[PDB]
Amino acid sequence: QVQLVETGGGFVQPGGSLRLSCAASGVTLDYYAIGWFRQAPGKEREGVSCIGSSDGRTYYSDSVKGRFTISRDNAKNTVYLQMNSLKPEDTAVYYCALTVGTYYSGNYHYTCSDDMDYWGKGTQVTVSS
Amino acid sequence: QLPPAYTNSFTRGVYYPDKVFRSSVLHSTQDLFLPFFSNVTWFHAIHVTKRFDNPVLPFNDGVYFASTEKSNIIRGWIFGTTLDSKTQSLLIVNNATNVVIKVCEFQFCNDPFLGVYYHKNNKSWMESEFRVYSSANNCTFEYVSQPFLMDLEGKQGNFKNLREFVFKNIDGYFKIYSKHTPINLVRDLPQGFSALEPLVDLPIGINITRFQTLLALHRSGDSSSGWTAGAAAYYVGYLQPRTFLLKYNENGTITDAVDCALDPLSETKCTLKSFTVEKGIYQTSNFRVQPTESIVRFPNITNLCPFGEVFNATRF
Amino acid sequence: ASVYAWNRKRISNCVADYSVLYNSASFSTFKCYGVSPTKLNDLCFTNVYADSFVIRGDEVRQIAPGQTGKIADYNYKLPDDFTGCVIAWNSNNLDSKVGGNYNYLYRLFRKSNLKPFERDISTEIYQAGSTPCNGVEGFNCYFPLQSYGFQPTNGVGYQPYRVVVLSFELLHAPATVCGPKKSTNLVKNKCVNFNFNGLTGTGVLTESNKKFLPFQQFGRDIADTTDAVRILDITPCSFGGVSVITPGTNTSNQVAVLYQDVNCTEVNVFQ
Ligand SMILES: *[C@@H]1O[C@H](CO)[C@@H](O)[C@H](O)[C@H]1NC(C)=O
Ligand SMILES: *[C@@H]1O[C@H](CO)[C@@H](O)[C@H](O)[C@H]1NC(C)=O
Ligand SMILES: *[C@@H]1O[C@H](CO)[C@@H](O)[C@H](O)[C@H]1NC(C)=O
Ligand SMILES: *[C@@H]1O[C@H](CO)[C@@H](O)[C@H](O)[C@H]1NC(C)=O
Ligand SMILES: *[C@@H]1O[C@H](CO)[C@@H](O)[C@H](O)[C@H]1NC(C)=O
Ligand SMILES: *[C@@H]1O[C@H](CO)[C@@H](O)[C@H](O)[C@H]1NC(C)=O
Ligand SMILES: *[C@@H]1O[C@H](CO)[C@@H](O)[C@H](O)[C@H]1NC(C)=O
Ligand SMILES: *[C@@H]1O[C@H](CO)[C@@H](O)[C@H](O)[C@H]1NC(C)=O
Numbered sequence: 001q002v003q004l005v006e007t008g009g010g011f012v013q014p015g016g017s018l019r020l021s022c023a024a025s026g027v028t029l030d031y032y033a034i035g036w037f038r039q040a041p042g043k044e045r046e047g048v049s050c051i052g053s054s055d056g057r058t059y060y061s062d063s064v065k066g067r068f069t070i071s072r073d074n075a076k077n078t079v080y081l082q083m084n085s086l087k088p089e090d091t092a093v094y095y096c097a098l099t100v101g102t103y104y105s106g107n108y109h110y111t112c113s114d115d116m117d118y119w120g121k122g123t124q125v126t127v128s129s
Numbered sequence: 130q131l132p133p134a135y136t137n138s139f140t141r142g143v144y145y146p147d148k149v150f151r152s153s154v155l156h157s158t159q160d161l162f163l164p165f166f167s168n169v170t171w172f173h174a175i176h177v178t179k180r181f182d183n184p185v186l187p188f189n190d191g192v193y194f195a196s197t198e199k200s201n202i203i204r205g206w207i208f209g210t211t212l213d214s215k216t217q218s219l220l221i222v223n224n225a226t227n228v229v230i231k232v233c234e235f236q237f238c239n240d241p242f243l244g245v246y247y248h249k250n251n252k253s254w255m256e257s258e259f260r261v262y263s264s265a266n267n268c269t270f271e272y273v274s275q276p277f278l279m280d281l282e283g284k285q286g287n288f289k290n291l292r293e294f295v296f297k298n299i300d301g302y303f304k305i306y307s308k309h310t311p312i313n314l315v316r317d318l319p320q321g322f323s324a325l326e327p328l329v330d331l332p333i334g335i336n337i338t339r340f341q342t343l344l345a346l347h348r349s350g351d352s353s354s355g356w357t358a359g360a361a362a363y364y365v366g367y368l369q370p371r372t373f374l375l376k377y378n379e380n381g382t383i384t385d386a387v388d389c390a391l392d393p394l395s396e397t398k399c400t401l402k403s404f405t406v407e408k409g410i411y412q413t414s415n416f417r418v419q420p421t422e423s424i425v426r427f428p429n430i431t432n433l434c435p436f437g438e439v440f441n442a443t444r445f
Numbered sequence: 446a447s448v449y450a451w452n453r454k455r456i457s458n459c460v461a462d463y464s465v466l467y468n469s470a471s472f473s474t475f476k477c478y479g480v481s482p483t484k485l486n487d488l489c490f491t492n493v494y495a496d497s498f499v500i501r502g503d504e505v506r507q508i509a510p511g512q513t514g515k516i517a518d519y520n521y522k523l524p525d526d527f528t529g530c531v532i533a534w535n536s537n538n539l540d541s542k543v544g545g546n547y548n549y550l551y552r553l554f555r556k557s558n559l560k561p562f563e564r565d566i567s568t569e570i571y572q573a574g575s576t577p578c579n580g581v582e583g584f585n586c587y588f589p590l591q592s593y594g595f596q597p598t599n600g601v602g603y604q605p606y607r608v609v610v611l612s613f614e615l616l617h618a619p620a621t622v623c624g625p626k627k628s629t630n631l632v633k634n635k636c637v638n639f640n641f642n643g644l645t646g647t648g649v650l651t652e653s654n655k656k657f658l659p660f661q662q663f664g665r666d667i668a669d670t671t672d673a674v675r676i677l678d679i680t681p682c683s684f685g686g687v688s689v690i691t692p693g694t695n696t697s698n699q700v701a702v703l704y705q706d707v708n709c710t711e712v713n714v715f716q
Contacts, residue, residue, distance in 0.1 A: 028544040028596055047584060059584045100594040103546040104568070109588045113553065150657050150664035150673065269457055269492065301618035327660055332458075334491075334618025381658040 001026045002118065006096045009123030016086040016127060022079035022096035031101040033110035034079050036070075038092035039122065050112035051079065052101065057110070063090065086127045093122035130178070134171040136318055138163070138366055142193040143373070143386050144295045144306040144325035151377045155402055157389075159372040161297055163193045165388045169318075169366035174202055174344060174358040181358050183242065183342045185212070191297040191368030192340065197288035197312065197319075201279060202361035204243050204343035205229075206296070207261065208303075210336050212237040217268060217335050219303070222343060225256050226276050232333050233268030237261065244346045244356065245281060254281035257348065270333060283347060283359045287315040295325055297368065301334030318364065324375075324383035374399045448498040448520045449552045449590065450566060456493035457621045462486070464625075466532075474505055474606070477530030480613065486624025490613040493529075493622055496521070497609045499549060501593065502602040505533045508610070519552040521610075524561040529612040536607045540595040550590040562612075636682030641674050648681040650674075683707045 003025040010018040022034060035050035049060045049070055056072050071080040079096060097116040102109035142163035146156075173180045186192075188208065196203045201223075209218035214236040222229040225245070238260055246257035291310035296303070307328040312319045347357040376385040389399035396413045397406050446452040463485040467475065480488065500508070500516060507514030510527045517523070540547070554571040572578045574585025582588065595605045633650040644663060653676040657664065664673030671679055683706075690701040704712060 028598065029594065030545050050584070061584055100592050101546045102550070102588060102590060102592050103548060104550060104588075104590050108546075109582070109590070111553075111587045111591060113587060113591075145660070148660065148662045150655075150661040152655065152666075154667060269455060326658075332619050332621055334616065380656065381661050 002028060002098070004096060004098055004118060004120035006094055006120055006123045009094065009125045011126045012086065014086060014088050014127055014129065017082070017084040018086065018125065020079075020081040020083075020094060020096075020123065022081070024077050024098060027077065027098070029098075029100055031108065033099050033101060033112055035097050035099070035112040035116055036079075036081060037095050037097060037116070037119075038090070039095065040092035040124065043092055045114055047112060047114075049081070050110065052108065052110035054101070054108055059110070059112070063087070086125075088127050088129075091125050091127050093124040095119045095122045131180070133182075134173070135168045136171045136364060138165075138167050138169045138193075138195075138318060138364070139320060140165055140322050140386070141195070141318065142293065142295065142325070142366060143322070143375070143383065145327060145383060146373075146375070148327075150381045152381060153377065153379055155374055155376045155404070157372060157374045157399060157402060159370065161191045161299075161368040162371045162373050162388070163295075163366050163368055164371060165391050167366060169193070169195070169364045172342070172363050172365065174361040174363075176357050176360065179356070179358050181344070181346075181356075183240075183344055185339050185341055186365060188296075188298070188337045188340050189367060190370070191295065193364075193366040193368060194294040194296065195318070195364035195366075196290075196292040196294075197314070197362045197364075198290045198292060199286060199288050200283040200345075200359050200361065201281070202283075202345045202359045203292070203363060204345050206340055206342060207237065207241060208296075208337045208340045209235075209237070210338040212339065214264060219333060219335070219337065220261065221305075225279065225281055228274035230270075230272045230274075230331065231265075231268075232270030232331075232335070233265040235262035236264050238263070241341065241343065242346065243343055244348060247347050247349045249349055252282070254283075256281075261343070270331070287313070288360075288362065289313065291319055293323075293325055294328075295368070296340075298333075298337050301332060303331045303333045303337070305329055305331075316362070322385060324386075372399065374402065376404060446498060447549045447551065448500050448504075448516060449550055449568075450564060451496045451498040451521055453494055453496045453564075456495060457491070459622060460625060461493070461622050462625045472532050472534050474531070474533035476509070478510065479526070479528040480530060486626060488613075489615075489620035489623040491616045491618055491620045491622070492614040494612045494614065495609055496612075497607075499536070499605050499607050500551075502604050502606055505531075505606050505608060508608060515553065516551060518558040519555040519565075520559075522559040522561045522563060523610075527612065528614070529610065531608060531610045533606045533608045535604055537595075537597060537604045540605050541597060544596055545594075546592045547595060549593045549595070551593065552589050553591040554587060554589040633677065639674075639679070644671065644674065646671060646679060648679045650677040651680055653678050683711055 005023050007021045007023070008019045010016070031054045033050055033052050036048050037045050038048055039045055047061065048063070049058065049068055051058050051070055051072060053072060058070060060068060067084050069082050073080050097119050099112055099116045102111060146158040146160045172182045205222035207218065207220050210216050212218060214234045216234065217232060218235045218237065220229065220231040220235065241261035244258040245254050247254055289312065291312045293308040293310065295306040305328045306325045308323060308325040310319065310323060342363060344358060347359050348355060372389040374387045374389065375383045378384040385404065387395045387398050389396050393413065394406065397411050398404060400411060400413050467482060504514065504516040507517045508521060508523065508531060510523045511525055552565060554573065559565065568590055570578065570582055570586050571589045573587055576585065578586040636647060636649045638647045639650065642662065653673055655673060655676070657676055662675050663671060666672040673679065685707050686705045688703045688705065690703060709716060
């Protein structure tokens with residue numbers, strides 16, 4: 001019954017600033033990697049960020065430019081992602097997804113494949129002239 | 130260095146051809162037997178060089194191995210084709226503790242052997258060195274028998290025990306046949322006839338082309354020079370496919386035997402299926418001439434097939 | 446061991462009873478191919494290779510000859526002509542940890558599919574991105590190993606199944622593993638069908654006076670036919686001819702019957 005949800009997709013002219021909330025419920029895993037994957041129409045399933053819950057190490061793509069900040073809300077079991085300087089092509093519906101951690105050789109790995117366990121209803125972001 | 134010595138084996142090296150009981154009957158069986166009165170290679174072990182001879186010998190169709198011992202110098206055998214861990218090998222040892230039969234890919238050294246140390250302070254002998262193999266990774270067959278202890282000392286005098294073995298390898302089965310005998314000679318081959326009872330039929334299923342021998346030495350300067358072999362002798366002969374007429378007795382033992390290819394009389398006995406040949410004339414076989422140097426004859430005309438007319442045609 | 450590195454052990458040089466193994470309520474999943482459940486004891490094999498691991502409930506169906514899947518392609522491949530079969534049973538009690546990552550891992554990424562019966566020890570990073578990863582773990586350079594997460598509350602499809610696959614091999618040598626072929630009771634003083642160590646026949650088994658040798662099993666008399674066995678003598682029971690003595694139908698109708706060479710203490714009776 002582990003549930004995930006995304007909120008906060010926002011529409012504005014180019015260069016805006018937006019907040020995305022990834023709220024989970026009934027998580028049964030002490031450690032879990034959470035990722036954000038975009039999908040608008042005509043736009044496939046490619047990763048933008050994925051984060052390890054044990055310490056907060058962050059993997060991110062060549063399009064982060066630093067405007068993608070993801071904070072691990074520990075108390076409210078949430079991923080708080082904020083993006084400024086909106087990119088007109090990064091417009092998409094976004095899924096935030098949860099995977100089990102990896103404990104190999106006494107160290108933790110956080111892998112976020114194209115298919116990542118359960119997904120959640122997406123939030124669409126539209127930014128264009 | 131000294132050239133290998135030969136010996137004339139006399140009615141020696143006969144094993145039970147099959148498992149079936151037979152009483153007061155004569156059975157003519159065609160098996161891999163040891164020919165009567167044959168040259169077997171003789172290998173010594175005498176302190177007097179020191180005559181340390183454990184060379185590599187072929188394993189063509191079976192091996193007869195006699196051993197005249199007084200101190201259990203003979204230890205065992207190693208079987209294989211390459212003996213370099215490239216192909217699976219086999220090992221049998223009558224160690225001072227157990228009986229060991231391994232079948233595995235072993236990296237055999239140039240001179241595999243065993244050595245029992247002797248201490249001058251106390252009359253005790255214990256196994257010291259065992260240099261046969263180094264590694265063993267991929268293999269299946271393994272066996273170590275129940276532990277047991279024997280003398281381990283080297284007595285003075287002449288040979289007193291005769292250990293006879295026959296090794297055969299056919300249909301993936303390695304059969305060892307064994308026999309023990311009390312003998313009181315000095316330096317010879319014991320006379321008389323005694324059949325060799327089976328010992329075990331190991332289901333190995335490998336190619337064995339060559340084999341060696343394992344001997345026990347005595348130590349009491351340099352490791353490569355400070356060794357004494359101790360007195361013993363072992364006889365090696367080769368088995369050939371021959372037909373033997375074996376006479377049993379009231380019990381199941383093979384009391385006597387003849388070989389059909391020793392002399393005309395033995396062949397006649399084989400034909401008559403009896404040890405006693407009555408006065409007369411008997412057809413036994415057929416003398417024939419085996420032709421050699423086959424010759425083929427054809428007309429001598431090449432006929433000048435015109436390959437050149439096409440290969441060299443000037444303008445092409 | 447985990448599925449990515451399955452442990453293989455060899456069984457040989459022993460007699461194997463599969464009947465107890467097959468009639469066991471513990472083993473929920475038992476599908477066998479290339480072997481007969483009715484005649485498994487009769488069949489003999491040189492070597493047995495047992496590969497043991499643990500997988501998910503759904504992945505059990507993936508482990509089958511000619512079947513492809515995420516686990517099958519990258520962790521354990523079964524040959525098309527595979528001889529032997531697989532055994533699976535639930536082990537949710539062993540993985541009783543409430544929640545967390547486990548050391549059990551599977552190779553979710555690989556460059557190409559495995560050859561049959563191939564093991565991949567190496568766990569180097571899979572360079573998914575076309576851009577040179579340059580040996581850096583991260584995005585587009587995902588770690589090939591993925592954990593399982595066997596929780597007790599998980600559904601039946603996610604419960605751990607302990608899967609062991611037995612492969613039977615008959616090399617260029619006589620087999621070393623055979624069925625129990627348990628012996629039945631011995632019956633004598635009456636001609637019966639006997640099969641002693643592969644020696645088949647019919648006849649009366651009788652107490653023996655002849656003494657064999659320790660290694661001797663069978664026994665043959667003149668003309669090379671079995672007369673004793675290990676010790677009992679084999680004597681075929683009374684067979685012969687039957688003739689009818691008649692005075693002629695012209696003078697009478699009743700007849701006498703001669704059973705030749707038969708001690709009729711077995712079968713107006715004269716010997
Ligand atoms: C066989 O033994 C006899 C023994 O006198 C010997 O003369 C002969 O040379 C031997 N045969 C061979 C081939 O060496
Ligand atoms: C014999 O003496 C040696 C000393 O070289 C010693 O190591 C060994 O234990 C002794 N054995 C016995 C039985 O006294
Ligand atoms: C033994 O040698 C024969 C040579 O014909 C070969 O066919 C066979 O494969 C070999 N077997 C082993 C176990 O080396
Ligand atoms: C062999 O047969 C003889 C009968 O002549 C008998 O005395 C002897 O005991 C038998 N051998 C054995 C080992 O029983
Ligand atoms: C074949 O041999 C015969 C016999 O001497 C000879 O006359 C003839 O010329 C030969 N032919 C050729 C083509 O060598
Ligand atoms: C022409 O070709 C033929 C091939 O049949 C060859 O034998 C011959 O030598 C060639 N000519 C010369 C001059 O080598
Ligand atoms: C028996 O044979 C005699 C010949 O003397 C004949 O007369 C008679 O009819 C025969 N009886 C029967 C029943 O055939
Ligand atoms: C026939 O059998 C009886 C008992 O079964 C025996 O007394 C008799 O001697 C047998 N006949 C012969 C000819 O031995």
